[PDB]
Tab-separated table of C-alpha atoms in Angstrom:
chain	number	residue	atom	x	y	z
A	1491	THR	CA	0.000	0.000	0.000
A	1492	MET	CA	1.360	3.384	-1.074
A	1493	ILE	CA	0.353	6.820	0.197
A	1494	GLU	CA	0.542	10.009	-1.864
A	1495	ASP	CA	3.094	12.473	-0.495
A	1496	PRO	CA	1.972	15.982	0.432
A	1497	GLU	CA	4.494	16.935	-2.246
A	1498	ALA	CA	2.734	16.092	-5.502
A	1499	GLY	CA	4.461	13.532	-7.719
A	1500	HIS	CA	6.086	11.746	-4.782
A	1501	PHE	CA	4.889	8.661	-2.911
A	1502	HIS	CA	5.818	6.701	0.208
A	1503	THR	CA	4.992	3.297	1.687
A	1504	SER	CA	2.165	3.083	4.218
A	1505	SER	CA	3.078	2.348	7.832
A	1506	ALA	CA	-0.005	0.124	7.915
């Protein structure tokens, strides 16, 4: 599961 970063165009992995 990925979550969209507040900074558009970037993503990070969910902690859950």
